[PDB]
Amino acid sequence: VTLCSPTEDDWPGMFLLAAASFTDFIGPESATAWRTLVPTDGAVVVRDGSEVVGMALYMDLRLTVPGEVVLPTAGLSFVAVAPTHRRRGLLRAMCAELHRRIADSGYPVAALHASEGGIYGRFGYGPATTLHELTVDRRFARFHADAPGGGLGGSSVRLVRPTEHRGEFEAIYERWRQQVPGGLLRPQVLWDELLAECKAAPGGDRESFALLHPDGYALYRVDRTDLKLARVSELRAVTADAHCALWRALIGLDSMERISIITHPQDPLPHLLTDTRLARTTWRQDGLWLRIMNVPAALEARGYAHEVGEFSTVLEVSDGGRFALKIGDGRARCTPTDAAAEIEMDRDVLGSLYLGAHRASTLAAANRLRTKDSQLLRRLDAAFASDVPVQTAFEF
């Protein structure tokens, strides 16, 4: 068993492993497009002795974090070990090598979407965003008297074919992704792929439509089996006005009984309605997971809440160093120290804290972050909160 970077001749064997490991496998043509985002030396394979029995890679991404700061981010993906070679340490070996390459290349953070919740904690990944599915019975939905844009006159929203309005979707998305933590840059090849998914499929998915506003859009399609359900695949709103107008239009889809969307826990949609209960939470799951590769670089890059007064502490990350951390005026300085730790946590826990999706106080109640100072805990909680709620961009 050898571990190395794949040559062009390894890729058919990788695509086989992928087809056999991922039911949603996008196929060799789409995989070849995503492949443009994998840098030289961004992939590893394990060969038996010959054939590929393990693989893993990362893609070059740009991730927005609190304070509208954009970080270069290694997006781990296409990770698989053949059923014939599992529980033999191949994943451990591949992850160790890629993390070494990622850290040496100067990425401050790595990220992934997890096939199961039990795999990546041990490799230092913590779930950093939360997927929150809302399902609205639009037959009962009425907008609150307070909701923006209720009066007479035309709508600002147009029903359009997605493929005819690429330029506009690109520009709205680019605005959205820079202002929301969790935002990812979407390169040209991924827009190529996205807009190709919009067509009706040979007995597969039904046609996708779009609702377009100057400051937001929604892409949606009728569910394949539940013909009275419209599934919104993506709703990107730069303003509260755009968000409300788009929901007014979606709730106007008279042929549907239900509209669903995978969104974030702070989606204001329920508060737009006279009956908040009509926007039902029907599913909840971890979205993006984060591994902080360089503790000081990541902590100094992010913005912090201005409300909390300046404070100083000593943070130990379990195998990631001990640091004097000073947070004041929305900024952190994070320097080496051998002073006694006041806060201790595993690396995965820092990842969970990093985009504001999980409170330090909650992690502390589970003993995942240890301190004896309850005031310090309150201060950390407040500082690490994100003013702009964290959202999930696209799966990779």
Place this chain on the structure above:
Amino acid sequence: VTLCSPTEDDWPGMFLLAAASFTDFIGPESATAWRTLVPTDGAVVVRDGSEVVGMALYMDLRLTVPGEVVLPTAGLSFVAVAPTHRRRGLLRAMCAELHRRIADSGYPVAALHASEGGIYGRFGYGPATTLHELTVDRRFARFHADAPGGGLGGSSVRLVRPTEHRGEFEAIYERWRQQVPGGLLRPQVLWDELLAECKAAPGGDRESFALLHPDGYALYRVDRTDLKLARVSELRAVTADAHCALWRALIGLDSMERISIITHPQDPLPHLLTDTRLARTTWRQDGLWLRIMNVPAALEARGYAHEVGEFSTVLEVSDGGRFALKIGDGRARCTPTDAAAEIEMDRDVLGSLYLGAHRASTLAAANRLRTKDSQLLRRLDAAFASDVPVQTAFEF
């Protein structure tokens, strides 16, 4: 149609209306026990011309709010209008009269549990707690290396019959309710009623068991139809250690596939496990709803976050007054003013903010709270947050 306080002769007609309006109607014997909590003049009925066609009442409660402050609280309940007399304004009339009585009696807040989400917003009630059902497939559940109490030696938890340990449940609950916002005092009659529900029912509910720790307890029973599901009706933990020990024991219920509980969004349970995803959010709903009866009294009673620096603003509640509000050092002072409002909201919105379950920033994105100052919004968000996560006590 006359509206007045019921005489002893009206109660059989009220119990009829109740039986016909509430499928979960507790029955006349149990209703007669809850009745001990309804003060003189705490009930209204509407009679046709004669028979009761409408009813509503409130119970005297004690509710814990952020800062461990306990407020006298009017708990609205038993609200119904006969199917023969609906959409005729009887609810409006009954609510107007009870609110007048409640305000005059000196209650700063009223509260209820809503049969539907669309009814009470217009009467100034905002949803103030969130019910969050977690379901754990205990066959896969493993505790994290960090989780408290993993080593050898006896458990601190005992499997007991609930009815044999009333005194201990009472004392743990009394500790719990004083320290958690959302906490309600549970009078003797409600413990009488609770412990009577513990017995196996003639073809009804299965026997209830209890898991008892010095600092917490869990009451649970096997689901009537899904024999591999244990439903936890109530888990009251005063310490993180008690919470973890109780979950260790529940997850040890080898005969079960699944354990479910209706809990709060910040329950640390998922973080206790090696796979956070195993604690699945299977249902979400508004719990307790709040109507702030006296704006200055309520705002001055609550504690605020210490992290936010002192600030002053002018808050207008839509039909509830305009106030100079100064928040500093964890405390608010809230005085009459005719100065220009900086923040405006309907009364229901203040109720939603009051226990920290909903962020001002989220309500603002839906235009339910209006300000032009984004800094002020951040400050309000931080100040109104509850350090101790809000929980739901018992339904009434």
Place this chain on the structure above:
Amino acid sequence: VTLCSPTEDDWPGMFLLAAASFTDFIGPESATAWRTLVPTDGAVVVRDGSEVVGMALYMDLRLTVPGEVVLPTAGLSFVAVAPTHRRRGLLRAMCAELHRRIADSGYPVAALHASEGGIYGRFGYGPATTLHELTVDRRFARFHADAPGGGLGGSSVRLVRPTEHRGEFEAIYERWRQQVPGGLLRPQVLWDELLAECKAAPGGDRESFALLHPDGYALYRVDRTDLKLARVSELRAVTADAHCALWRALIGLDSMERISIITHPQDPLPHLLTDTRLARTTWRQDGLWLRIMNVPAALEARGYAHEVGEFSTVLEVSDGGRFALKIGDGRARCTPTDAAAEIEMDRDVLGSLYLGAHRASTLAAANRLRTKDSQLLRRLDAAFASDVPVQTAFEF
């Protein structure tokens, strides 16, 4: 194997057979009450050699037929053959004997409710009423501007406990049963039994309520398993105004999503609504079945439509005689003849025609009634129609 009238010592063996043959077996106490309606010599049993292996009986009923005419009617019931003695001709033997007794006793018609649709056709029973279940999603239901009783002021309907209003239900029902074909007299013992079913059952059925109008009533209860479904067990309306008022009240049952009732195909309910489609036909089945025992007596007893001009024909019933039939001015005269038949049908077919539930033209298209004269067919169709739609009274 002997066939005779049961002695008092046979009844425990009959009740055993019944318990084993009917899942809905009402039990020995209720069966003993219905037993008061069985005349002397109204029952037969077959004994092996000793124990009862077959039984059948009839009850003395009064049935309303078109023209508001009431006929003495033998209601066959409690018919069963032990699983150990089936397909041996016991049913044939028992039916032959009871029919002989029924005919000799002077009943012009016999009736039953069928456990399956394939049994009784061969014994001369035709399905004579149609059960039609309507289910209304009351959340969407709005009454048409034309529907009676929409304005302001009190309702004429009261929500009551059934057991406290026996006298009123009895009097309304007695009016209803005399004016509707399919109507049956309900003796005191059956009101005793009915009103005993109204109580909540030990883990069984939920409590029954009643909606009472001076000219109609509805009895209903929440479904045992679907807690948002109200099932109307019986709605007896003497006027269109009573029918509408009762439906207004039922549709006011705010706690329910759905209201269902087993009714007749001409129930005007759907036409009361702005969306007729909301009253969904969810089940359809034969109700009452009729065997005409004496052809001339039955045909002369009934009223016929006045619209059709006088006409004369010759009707042959397959093993039931040939008759000169003259119908004019709403009345028939039906005398023996050996003239050539113009219309031929089996006895069961006449039963199906008799209350107006099935058209002669429809039976003729299936060759169940044979004539060569299409004008005669049209005339028969018109004459046999019932001006008042046929309804189903109660099961026996």
Place this chain on the structure above:
Amino acid sequence: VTLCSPTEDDWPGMFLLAAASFTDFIGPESATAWRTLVPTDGAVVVRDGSEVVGMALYMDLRLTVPGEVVLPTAGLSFVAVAPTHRRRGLLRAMCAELHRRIADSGYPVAALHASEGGIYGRFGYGPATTLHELTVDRRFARFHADAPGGGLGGSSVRLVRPTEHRGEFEAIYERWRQQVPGGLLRPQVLWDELLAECKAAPGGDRESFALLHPDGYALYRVDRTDLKLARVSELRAVTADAHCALWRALIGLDSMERISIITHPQDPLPHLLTDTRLARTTWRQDGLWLRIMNVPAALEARGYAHEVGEFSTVLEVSDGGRFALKIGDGRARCTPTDAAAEIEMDRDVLGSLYLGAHRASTLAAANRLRTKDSQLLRRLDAAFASDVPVQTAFEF
């Protein structure tokens, strides 16, 4: 917002709206074929200011009504308003304009199939046919001794490929449509479309087969998901013999458990079987809806029942005129009058009465048709009945 007839450049925008409004949208190629039936000026669009936000059209049809009379009929279809422009009166505007065009063009009636039951009543459309789904468990089905064509010798029915027998289907259908009320002429383009649906679809519908008799045919296919269900899409029988022979053959489909068909309430199928209950009514719904455009023209065109003696009345249609109506010898004469009305009804109600699907007595019990004369009501009921049961042709 402008309302006018579409130009050739509007049609891509209409097809977009259609795709977004109708899940069953037949597609641009099929829509372009149906388009041949839309006359010049038969369509309207509403444009924002530019893009289509509303559309509606009618097709030129021929509808058979009682008495085998064929009426030119405007078939409304392709009606939609964009989700961004709803509840703004666009439907009202479009319907007003098309009705003006339809009335001026000299059509006595308009017709449609309704997406929901609550839309068209207000525009004067009443449901005029009833869809009645029967499902037969063919494993138990046995034909009655009376049913036509039971003896030995070959069947008159052949199992064929639909596309190889177009000429024969056309001729049988043309006979059927002229003799049944509800019948519609099926132009060549619709046979083109129909026979193209017969092929197996790329993962879609399974292959369609046909059963062919000289006087009738049935088209059917196995259900896509329930492989033991055969769904009959269309059964057109000119004789009772053809109807029975076709059902004998369908019930011979040994590979199937169930056969279903959407048929009419008077389908004689159940009476063909020894157990009528085996032909289960599994769904019921309004089919064709009618708006009578010219009251006197429509009432004089139809045939009436000969059985009812000559009578004269005065009928007021709510915004449709008042008429002296004389019906005798199967014919009506309907002339202007200002004499006092004896019968009053909204226009939609007349549409419901017109093909004999609904009884005047039933509409009257719901107060949808008002008279004080119960004899007059009986006479109207009898006169408006259709001797040949009304059927539904094809959806448009």
